[PDB]
Design an enzyme around this catalytic site. Sequence first.
Site, PDB file in Angstrom:
ATOM      1  N   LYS A  63     -16.812  56.570 -49.505  1.00 18.15           N
ATOM      2  CA  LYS A  63     -17.399  56.308 -48.205  1.00 18.15           C
ATOM      3  C   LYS A  63     -18.523  57.333 -47.960  1.00 18.15           C
ATOM      4  O   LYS A  63     -18.281  58.495 -47.674  1.00 18.15           O
ATOM      5  CB  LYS A  63     -16.407  56.312 -47.072  1.00 18.15           C
ATOM      6  CG  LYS A  63     -17.105  56.250 -45.714  1.00 18.15           C
ATOM      7  CD  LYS A  63     -16.579  55.152 -44.806  1.00 18.15           C
ATOM      8  CE  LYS A  63     -17.014  55.431 -43.364  1.00 18.15           C
ATOM      9  NZ  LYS A  63     -16.258  54.693 -42.326  1.00 18.15           N
ATOM     10  N   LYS A 102     -18.254  52.071 -50.474  1.00 14.52           N
ATOM     11  CA  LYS A 102     -19.073  51.659 -49.319  1.00 14.52           C
ATOM     12  C   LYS A 102     -19.951  52.802 -48.860  1.00 14.52           C
ATOM     13  O   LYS A 102     -19.590  53.969 -48.906  1.00 14.52           O
ATOM     14  CB  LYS A 102     -18.143  51.184 -48.210  1.00 14.52           C
ATOM     15  CG  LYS A 102     -18.615  50.834 -46.846  1.00 14.52           C
ATOM     16  CD  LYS A 102     -17.399  50.809 -45.892  1.00 14.52           C
ATOM     17  CE  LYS A 102     -17.759  51.534 -44.603  1.00 14.52           C
ATOM     18  NZ  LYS A 102     -16.893  51.100 -43.465  1.00 14.52           N
TER      19      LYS A 102
END
Lengths: 133, 328, 328, 328
Positions: A63, A102
Amino acid sequence: DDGTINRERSVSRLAAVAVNYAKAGAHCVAPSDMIDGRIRDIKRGLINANLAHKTFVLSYAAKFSGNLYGPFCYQLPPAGRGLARRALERDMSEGADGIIVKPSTFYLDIMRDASEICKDLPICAYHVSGEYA
Amino acid sequence: MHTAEFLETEPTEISSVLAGGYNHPLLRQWQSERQLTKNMLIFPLFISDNPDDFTEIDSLPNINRIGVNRLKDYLKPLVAKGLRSVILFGVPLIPGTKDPVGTAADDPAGPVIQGIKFIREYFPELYIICDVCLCEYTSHGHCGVLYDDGTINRERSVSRLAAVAVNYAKAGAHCVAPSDMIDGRIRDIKRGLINANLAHKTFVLSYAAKFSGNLYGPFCYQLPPAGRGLARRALERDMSEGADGIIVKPSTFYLDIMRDASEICKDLPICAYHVSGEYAMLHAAAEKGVVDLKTIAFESHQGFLRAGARLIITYLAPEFLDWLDEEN
Amino acid sequence: MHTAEFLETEPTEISSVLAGGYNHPLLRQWQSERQLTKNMLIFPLFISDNPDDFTEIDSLPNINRIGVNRLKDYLKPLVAKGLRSVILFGVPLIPGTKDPVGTAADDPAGPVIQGIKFIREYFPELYIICDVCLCEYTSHGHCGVLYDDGTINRERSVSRLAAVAVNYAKAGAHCVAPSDMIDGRIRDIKRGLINANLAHKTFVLSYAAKFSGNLYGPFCYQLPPAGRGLARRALERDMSEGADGIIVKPSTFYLDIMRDASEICKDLPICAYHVSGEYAMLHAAAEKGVVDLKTIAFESHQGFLRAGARLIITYLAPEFLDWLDEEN
Amino acid sequence: MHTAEFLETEPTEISSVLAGGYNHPLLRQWQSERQLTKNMLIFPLFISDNPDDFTEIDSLPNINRIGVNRLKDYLKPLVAKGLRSVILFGVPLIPGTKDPVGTAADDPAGPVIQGIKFIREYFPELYIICDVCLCEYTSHGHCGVLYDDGTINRERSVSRLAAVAVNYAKAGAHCVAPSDMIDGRIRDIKRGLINANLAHKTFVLSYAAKFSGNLYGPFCYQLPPAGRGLARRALERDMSEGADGIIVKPSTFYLDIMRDASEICKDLPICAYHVSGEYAMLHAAAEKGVVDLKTIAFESHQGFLRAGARLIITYLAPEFLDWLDEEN
Ligand SMILES: [Hg+2]
Ligand SMILES: [Hg+2]
Ligand SMILES: [Hg+2]
């Protein structure tokens, strides 16, 4: 005290939730914090809670931080290509059964590293809202 | 009542604590595989045939169709901004120059060669890369010399491309970036430069990875978006054939491929190309405000540098040279 | 009295608990390296010379010897079932077409070429693969042009095979799968297609791995079941020689080899071939009830997909297109 | 007229000529990564509780449910045939021995332990492997100690399995092959044998790869046919946990996995298991004549040896010991 995250606490607290979901009837749990070692603990918790064998820990091992979540805490640098490899290899070790990368389209290389590194773990791509909108 | 449950922990593993390597703003520079300088940025040029031209193109662009008499002004500033390179794109606009073999291509009196003789003299500093393709100088407009109302005649088109490739290189251009994608066109362009005894001066910067997607103009030989294996074979081939550097495009949507590029072509400087599509996509996205341009521009560009590229061909060049000057 | 002893444990290691990655039925799809679609299935065709034919073969088969006038019916449904490909097998049945060089092979008026002109027109959708071998069109019947009452005359047979290979490819066939196993036959088939200027349209799908076992018909050049090293050298060679994809056969008994295939030939789409032997072995086994066909069919076939193959040549094609439509 | 076209060749590459390495029948032995001996074959035994038993099971089998008083005859010959090992399978047939914790498991007076004391004395030569699982000695019959009308109670079942594991090992058995597949059961079985100070005598032969398919009986923890990654993680784990050798099953349908086994677990003797399914599938197939047993039996078995295995657990053991004696 009007600062920086209290790791061990927050973790102790997260692992708590993680299991309640998992007790409630949820199949998978995808921790989205990024607070070190939160996985070892979420897996351990599910174990004592004797749910280890039913719940799929799908970490967010990757992330990053960019203008793609909402226009304009612990979170990996866009250029840090090495943390992300160490951050996967760690979560893989800690029990993660699958992993999340992500954002995605702007980090296909990282997603690429993911596959190599975490070869035997189903990899998942996340098209963040930013990308989306 | 519903109370906040807190599980019982174990002592923190020293191998779960990375976070201290990335806390200060400086350690986030100390983690970048490579930091973005101005000498990385390569600016594309679309030199038109009307030497008085400076025609704006568009979809979201702030890019043009300049002429050889405008060049000393549009280029002037940028260079003083530190610009070290450009990739020439010639634009014939006269009513009768196309044809069956893009003859007007290597044309000593066209946009391209009449552009390359202009820089080497008014801006000796710059570094000239020349895209090499028969798309634009052909009647059908395909990239290559075609057959009977069909499919590209390889060996011909190649024999013809290698021809141009060398004329540029004879004209005074430093680099040649073939943009066809017609098999073995590199072996030949390198061989040609060799006989032409220019091998040792010209930088063959192949486009080893030119995929096909809605990112070049909204809606010939060209690799599939999903074909991840051709692209590896298509690099390894061009590396073998003489290519000294390589190009991956588009970029942001193919960072993985760019990533493969670095591994495979480890000893060859890799270059990222931010296709117009991507480009006009970012502006378009910044206007509706879905993100702030400047923000998304460097992230997307360090995406190049992390993913593998030590060079970049982008339209945000006017922009970065400003920016990279900044501190707080 | 004998009581149940229970040893004294240690806390469970987090690295001994995989079981949660595979519990739900969906996570068992999420663990499959690749899921089986209809567009993977390639159906073999045995196009006979009597254009009125539709003769059943057998050992356990539900496979035939069709004619060009039956084709528009047998093929019709399957295609509407989503079928995207077929591998043609020509069957000359006339009394005098064999011979010393399988001349009748590339024969513009035979099963094969008179089949390939039939599909490209009645079923333009399909994708035609053509097995390329001199076994079937030769008097002795060996696969290749032979010497003096002995051993295959390589260079001849090859010169002859490459000939056929191209005629198919000139006739309108998309793919050519040489099934000989005569050294260097690929370098030549690729070269031929090149001069013939068809290199860029035809998919050379070699049979890089054709072993010898009781699985083709109960009981020339062909690799040993135990020779695991030739097969690796035999792939690496065909990859080098131009092959664009490769075939491993038989399959289920050679998943390891198919496995080597994937590693070695990583960037080349790998195809699994469920030889008739395997095929009639499964039916035969299902009838006595030793297992339920449908069950053993997908396991055996995902064996292909796990083991390495993104394509498959099987007789259970009629069957899967039905099945893969299903959910609960 | 249609004439046989023969393309124009190039001189044969020395690197396209492998064929001479495999021509003589002997060079096809000289290419086998390993040749099949009798000392590889491990025979499974299903020792029933009625010491007068010798009950035939079946689907295609020629396998039985013997008793401790039959053993000295059924075993006698085979051993004189050179048999060096067996894998015991105990069969309780008395009306009240099952239960909530498969207590009757490690039972000093049952099939298994009353079998292992029989061999170590009448056939000291043999090498005893004992399958270790709670499936067969439990009322529900699941492999492990279960919860409240659900899912296996790991730590319990494990604590219970490790218990049995050691009793066999205390009883005089050489090897213990856990067949559960309950996480970390190996770390524990090895630890137990350690405290029990038997670590240095007993060979932990895990079943690191036990998949689920229609090949065990026509139609708990157990790996998916398509999950190729668990199986690699499931080996690497058991290797780490103490396993001295490993088992892959089924086999013929998982040669790729067996192949992974060899790479991953390179320094550990790998064993192939020809599950009954496969077994009765081959006989069943031989009867209809889809192939000749003897033929398909060695191919399928050298499939083990090529694919990776230096050991084998098969029912064709009675058969091979005969065969491997033969020459022409
Ligand atoms: Hg072009
Ligand atoms: Hg043949
Ligand atoms: Hg069991």
